[PDB]
């Protein structure tokens, strides 16, 4: 018996010629297990797959021809995800999912991941395919189930059961630079709200007028948008910058033939400036924007407002605080007019700068300076609502010029049980209604 062809099956990413080079069997002279058996071992030595087998095929119509075939397994193994966590104003966070390239030689990159926190619970189910052409050029899709407890938040009360899909383009416009544009739909079920002027302006808005009495009310949307965003990214480090800046730009907006009419767009930019030799004392320069409007007709949804105040934006002040707050019809909780709330309900625009200045770590004089940021910080920030008509007696909140401010401490450690922040703030401009939060923790998510 003489070999003829030695064929590899299931040679999915792995070249053809490289693994002819790991197998020591010529093509035309006599076959020998002893050189068929050595092949097999070699191509394990590689340790590109997770099963190897031989298998001499006899050669149709041949007495004397038999096909050496090597069926081979890439063994690409999928990415397992678990995530726990605490923070102060989102409490008890968990952040477990999976994800799988391979799935099933389609060859998209299918994924399900989950969230659950005091106020959020989601869930999505990912599908893209990357090169895709030239580069790393993507199409993806996203179905997700999304519940949000306005109360839990801080917010005025409401509920928010949200269905939805995502459609959309990844170009990879440079090194440094990321370019998404996409298409998406949004079911959003909005129940049990707590009756008040800012939001009832909305549904008035809408054509769908509620009642006055109490909570229990709904409210189900169906809408369509265009979502476009870009990532500029020149940091030298991932997670302790010190040189480079990042800028993010994610706006949305409603196609006509969806239920809401209205556009959003954010803004998000960090400055990392190092003035000395060793980077160890950095001036961080970090801006937030925010903008949206009911697009002609109507109002813009009330669960796509924007807040300010904590941890991420404004620190000194209780997650979500800063800006427009609740006003009343009935009671508030546990009276024959309105009531004013110290409750926050967003705003449709908003406005955060933050000056930050890190510092090398006192105490410290070893090579576990490298884990450990210390930061002195003056934050800034407000948030209005554009539509809050003032034609008497209760705050304008249409007026951006009441700007928040503190001044604080900031310490980041990677910490053994993951990334360990913590600030301490003093909110030295606060206005009516406002709450403060001096001490604010957030352990590895």
Same mark, same amino acid.
């Given at each position: 018996?003489?070999?003829?062809?030695?064929?590899?099956?299931?040679?999915?990413?792995?070249?053809?010629?490289?693994?002819?080079?790991?197998?020591?069997?010529? *093509?035309?002279?006599?076959?020998?297990?002893?050189?068929?058996?050595?092949?097999?071992?070699?191509?394990?030595?590689?340790?590109?797959?997770?099963?190897?087998?031989?298998?001499?095929?006899?050669?149709?119509?041949?007495?004397?021809?038999?096909? !050496?075939?090597?069926?081979?397994? *890439?063994?690409?193994?999928?990415?397992?995800?678990?995530?726990?966590?605490?923070? @102060?104003?989102?409490?008890?966070?968990?952040?477990?999912?999976?994800?799988?390239?391979?799935?099933?030689?389609?060859?998209?990159?299918?994924?399900?991941?989950?969230?659950?926190?005091?106020?959020?619970?989601?869930?999505?189910?990912?599908?893209?395919?990357?090169?895709?052409?030239?580069?790393?050029?993507?199409?993806?899709?996203?179905?997700?189930?999304?519940?949000?407890?306005?109360?839990?938040?801080?917010?005025?009360?409401?509920?928010?059961?949200?269905?939805?899909?995502?459609?959309?383009?990844?170009?990879?416009?440079?090194?440094?630079?990321?370019?998404?544009?996409?298409?998406?739909?949004?079911?959003?079920?909005?129940?049990?709200?707590?009756?008040?002027?800012?939001?009832?302006?909305?549904?008035?808005?809408?054509?769908?007028?509620?009642?006055?009495?109490?909570?229990?009310?709904?409210?189900?949307?169906?809408?369509? @948008?265009?979502?476009?965003?870009?990532?500029?990214?020149?940091?030298?480090?991932?997670?302790?910058?010190?040189?480079?800046?990042?800028?993010?730009?994610?706006?949305?907006?409603?196609?006509?033939?969806?239920?809401?009419?209205?556009?959003?767009?954010?803004?998000?930019?960090?400055?990392?400036?190092?003035?000395?030799?060793?980077?160890?004392?950095? !001036?961080?320069?970090?801006?937030?924007?925010?903008?949206?409007? $009911?697009?002609? $007709?109507?109002?813009?949804?009330?669960?796509?407002?924007?807040?300010?105040?904590?941890?991420?934006?404004?620190?000194?002040?209780?997650?979500?605080?800063?800006?427009?707050?609740?006003?009343?019809?009935?009671?508030?909780?546990?009276?024959?007019?309105?009531?004013?709330?110290?409750?926050?309900?967003?705003?449709?625009?908003?406005?955060?700068?933050?000056?930050?200045?890190?510092?090398?770590?006192?105490?410290?004089?070893?090579?576990?300076?490298?884990?450990?940021? @210390?930061?002195?910080?003056?934050?800034?920030?407000?948030?209005?609502?554009?539509?809050?008509?003032?034609?008497?007696?209760?705050?304008?909140?249409?007026?951006?010029?009441?700007?928040?401010?503190?001044?604080?401490?900031?310490?980041?450690?990677?910490?053994?049980?993951?990334?360990?922040?913590?600030?301490?703030?003093?909110?030295?401009?606060?206005?009516?209604?406002?709450?403060?939060?001096?001490?604010?923790?957030?352990?590895?998510?």
């Amino acid at each position: 018996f003489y070999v003829r062809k030695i064929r590899f099956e299931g040679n999915d990413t792995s070249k053809d010629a490289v693994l002819r080079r790991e197998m020591r069997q010529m *093509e035309g002279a006599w076959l020998g297990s002893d050189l068929v058996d050595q092949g097999k071992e070699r191509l394990n030595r590689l340790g590109f797959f997770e099963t190897v087998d031989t298998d001499t095929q006899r050669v149709p119509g041949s007495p004397d021809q038999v096909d !050496v075939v090597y069926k081979v397994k *890439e063994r690409n193994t999928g990415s397992f995800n678990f995530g726990i966590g605490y923070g @102060t104003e989102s409490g008890v966070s968990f952040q477990a999912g999976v994800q799988q390239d391979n799935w099933l030689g389609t060859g998209y990159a299918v994924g399900i991941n989950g969230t659950k926190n005091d106020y959020q619970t989601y869930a999505e189910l990912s599908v893209t395919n990357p090169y895709f052409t030239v580069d790393g050029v993507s199409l993806g899709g996203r179905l997700f189930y999304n519940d949000f407890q306005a109360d839990d938040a801080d917010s005025s009360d409401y509920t928010n059961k949200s269905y939805g899909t995502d459609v959309t383009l990844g170009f990879p416009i440079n090194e440094e630079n990321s370019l998404r544009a996409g298409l998406g739909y949004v079911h959003n079920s909005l129940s049990n709200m707590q009756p008040q002027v800012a939001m009832w302006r909305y549904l008035y808005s809408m054509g769908e007028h509620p009642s006055t009495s109490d909570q229990d009310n709904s409210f189900k949307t169906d809408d369509f @948008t265009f979502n476009y965003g870009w990532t500029y990214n020149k940091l030298d480090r991932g997670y302790f910058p010190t040189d480079g800046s990042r800028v993010n730009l994610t706006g949305k907006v409603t196609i006509p033939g969806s239920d809401n009419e209205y556009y959003k767009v954010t803004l998000d930019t960090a400055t990392y400036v190092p003035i000395d030799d060793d980077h160890k004392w950095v !001036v961080l320069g970090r801006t937030r924007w925010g903008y949206g409007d $009911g697009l002609g $007709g109507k109002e813009m949804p009330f669960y796509e407002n924007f807040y300010a105040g904590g941890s991420s934006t404004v620190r000194g002040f209780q997650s979500n605080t800063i800006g427009p707050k609740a006003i009343y019809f009935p009671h508030q909780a546990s009276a024959k007019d309105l009531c004013k709330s110290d409750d926050a309900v967003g705003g449709n625009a908003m406005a955060v700068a933050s000056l930050e200045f890190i510092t090398p770590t006192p105490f410290i004089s070893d090579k576990y300076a490298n884990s450990v940021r @210390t930061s002195f910080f003056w934050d800034m920030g407000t948030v209005w609502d554009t539509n809050w008509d003032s034609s008497s007696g209760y705050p304008d909140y249409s007026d951006p010029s009441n700007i928040r401010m503190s001044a604080g401490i900031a310490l980041q450690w990677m910490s053994p049980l993951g990334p360990l922040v913590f600030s301490y703030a003093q909110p030295f401009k606060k206005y009516d209604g406002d709450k403060a939060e001096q001490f604010q923790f957030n352990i590895g998510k």
